[PDB]
RNA sequence: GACUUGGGCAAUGUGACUGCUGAUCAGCAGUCACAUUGCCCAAGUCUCUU
């Protein structure tokens, strides 16, 4: 209820309802693919389960 | 003991694709008969001609 912009709400909860692992993961995403060519980027995410 | 991956054996189905039969419909072709009025040649009968 501090902010009502659903974009800002989603970003805030993704930033603060999440472990530092996911925070750093998404930060690597944003610093890697901020505004690059969508055709240029082609990446894999490997997880356990 | 969780976690992950892969494979195999099952059954219960679905989605379609062709093959055959029948029916329906659209789509083309080859004809044939035959009234009507015309045209050009062949041979006939007759007026006239003679």
Resolution in A: 3.7
Instruction: Round to whole Å and give the CA distance between A10 and A13.
Output: 5
- Asked if the Cβ of residue A49 lies within 7 A of any atom of strand B, the reply is yes
DSSP A40: T
Neighbour count for residue A44 (Cβ, 10 Å)? 4
Tracing tokens 């690059």 back to the chain, one arrives at A36
- Asked if the Cβ of residue A6 lies within 7 A of any atom of strand B, the reply is no
Phi, psi of A37 (to 5 degrees): -70, 125
- CA A28 to mean position of chain CA atoms: 8
Q: Which residues of A4-42 are buried (b: 16+ CB within 10 A; e: fewer)?
A: eeeeeeeeeeeeeeeeeeeeeeeeeeeeeeeeeeeeeee
Q: How far is the CA of A27 from the C1' of B20 (A)?
A: 65
């Amino acid at each position: 209820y501090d902010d009502d912009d659903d974009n800002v709400n989603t970003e805030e909860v993704i930033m603060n309802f999440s472990t530092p692992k996911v925070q750093r993961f998404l930060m690597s995403l944003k610093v890697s693919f901020a505004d690059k060519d969508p055709k240029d980027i082609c990446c894999l995410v490997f997880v356990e389960r």
